[PDB]
Design a protein around this ligand. Structure first.
Ligand SMILES: COc1ccc2[nH]c(I)c(CCNC(C)=O)c2c1
Length: 485
């Protein structure tokens, strides 16, 4: 009805006004604030420009086309209006991809180096982003995918002209960036949780008294076995989670080797009685193996981490694995599975990594660890400690900027996901699926994606305190005249 046409005009009127003033404030704030003037925020200004180009020329033409109830301008006006929209939408999705990579590299650099991360090639990377967006929107002028759609009163990329062109745009410029940005922030969150999880006030070798060699000889004598290269496991007894079974099968491979005599194994945990029986059987057939099913105190586990030479983490799935970080804390060299989180916290210099769910590979890794002499081990324990020491280093940091940039992405994905879903549905059969798709649904998905062009400055002020403070500073400085005497 008549109200629905005027309602869509309100959305555009709001979007145009909020995008012009809002993104002008974002660009002005980055150069008027020292805390927001960092090089890593070149991508924010790049996105702010991308957001602004639609409200100066394409959107005003569309607003007038609602009232006109048709395209009363030229074909060149329809082609340029469409070409600049693509440069904007594809520009903003690849700019969000840029920030996602920048911030993931930031947390990794601050972990590895004492010096602050300085994105030197930032002005270079944005010039490649705009080269990539121009390479994607230009072929639509020659193909003729850009045409006027009366339902949405605009000149855009028609999903029903060429189905090969639409699936390529949906896969390469929506699904490809989405997976890159989702992975980037997923890896950041785990590392922020690992930073939170660790406790250097508890897992500190100050709490331990004597020499490592003395504390080991003492711990081994208590378990009724002489001195040797000791190994430890602390986890639940399960088939496919903590991987206690991979360790037990690997001990059987080693039991025949002459090298097994110079080994000690301290398995700790409860679970499957079948796995509990198998472990108790290897405890009876060999004096090297000691199994502890009972509940152990945080204090005695710290004592264990401190005396034991190696900690085996044969986990199948382990997202955080604070266990390895806690072991490295008190200089225990880990022999862990290459799992997401375990692969993050264990560098090739701070432990020996093995392929998960392989009893043969673990046996060869335990044999590799056995060949390491007292001198070679001392540097590993030093590196393990320096690795755990760099995780607790990032504890007082203000991780609020990551949240804002994440909300930026989350909202973008909400606005465009309906539009890109329709794109694939139309691509399947452009002839039949066009009348088969609801009219309200097509209009709403389009004006949702249009509304996104004004959403970025709103959240910048709402979530990032530095932007809110500078927004007010600009608003006052532009509207508080100077008087004399
Ligand atoms: C590829 O060249 C262009 C040119 C102009 C455009 N205006 C819009 I909105 C888009 C996104 C189109 N996405 C879907 C799912 O239909 C676009 C793309």
């Amino acid at each position: 009805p008549s109200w629905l046409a005027s309602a869509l005009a309100c959305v555009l009127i709001f979007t145009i006004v909020v995008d012009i003033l809002g993104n002008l404030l974002v660009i002005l704030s980055v150069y008027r604030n020292k805390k927001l003037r960092n090089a890593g925020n070149i991508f924010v200004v790049s996105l702010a420009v991308a957001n602004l180009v639609v409200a100066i020329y394409p959107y005003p033409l569309v607003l007038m086309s609602i009232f006109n109830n048709g395209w009363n301008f030229g074909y060149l006006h329809c082609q340029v209006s469409a070409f600049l929209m693509g440069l904007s939408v594809i520009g903003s999705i690849w700019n969000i991809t840029g920030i996602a990579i920048d911030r993931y590299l930031y947390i990794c650099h601050s972990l590895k180096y004492d010096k602050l991360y300085s994105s030197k090639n930032s002005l270079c990377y944005v010039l490649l982003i705009w080269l990539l967006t121009l390479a994607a929107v230009l072929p639509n002028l020659r193909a003729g995918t850009l045409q006027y759609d009366p339902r949405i009163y605009s000149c855009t990329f028609a999903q029903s002209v060429s189905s090969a062109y639409t699936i390529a745009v949906v896969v390469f410029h929506f699904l490809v960036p989405m997976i890159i940005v989702i992975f980037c922030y997923l890896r950041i969150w785990i590392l922020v949780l690992q930073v939170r999880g660790i406790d250097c006030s508890f897992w500190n070798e100050s709490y331990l008294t004597g020499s490592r060699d003395e504390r080991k000889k003492s711990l081994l004598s208590k378990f009724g076995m002489d001195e040797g290269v000791t190994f430890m496991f602390i986890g639940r007894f399960d088939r496919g989670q903590k991987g206690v079974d991979v360790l037990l099968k690997a001990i059987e491979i080693l039991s025949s080797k002459k090298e097994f005599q110079e080994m000690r194994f301290i398995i700790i945990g409860k679970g499957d009685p079948e796995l509990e029986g198998w472990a108790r059987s290897l405890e009876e057939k060999h004096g090297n193996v000691k199994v502890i099913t009972e509940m152990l105190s945080r204090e005695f586990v710290r004592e264990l981490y401190g005396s034991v030479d190696f900690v085996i983490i044969p986990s199948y799935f382990e997202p955080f694995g604070l266990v390895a970080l806690e072991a490295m804390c008190l200089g225990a060299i880990p022999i862990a599975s290459a799992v997401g989180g375990l692969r993050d916290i264990i560098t090739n210099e701070t432990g020996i990594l093995v392929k998960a769910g392989d009893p043969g590979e673990l046996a060869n890794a335990i044999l590799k660890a056995l060949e390491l002499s007292r001198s070679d081990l001392s540097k590993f324990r030093e590196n393990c400690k320096k690795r755990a020491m760099s995780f607790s280093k990032l504890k007082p940091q203000d991780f609020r900027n990551f949240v804002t940039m994440f909300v930026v992405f989350v909202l973008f994905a909400i606005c465009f996901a309906p539009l890109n879903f329709i794109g694939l549905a139309v691509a399947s059969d452009p002839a039949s699926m066009v009348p088969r798709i609801p009219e309200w649904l097509f209009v709403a998905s389009y004006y949702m994606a249009y509304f996104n062009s004004c959403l970025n400055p709103i959240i910048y002020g709402l979530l990032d305190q530095n932007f809110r403070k500078e927004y007010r500073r600009i608003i006052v400085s532009l509207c508080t005249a100077r008087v004399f005497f």
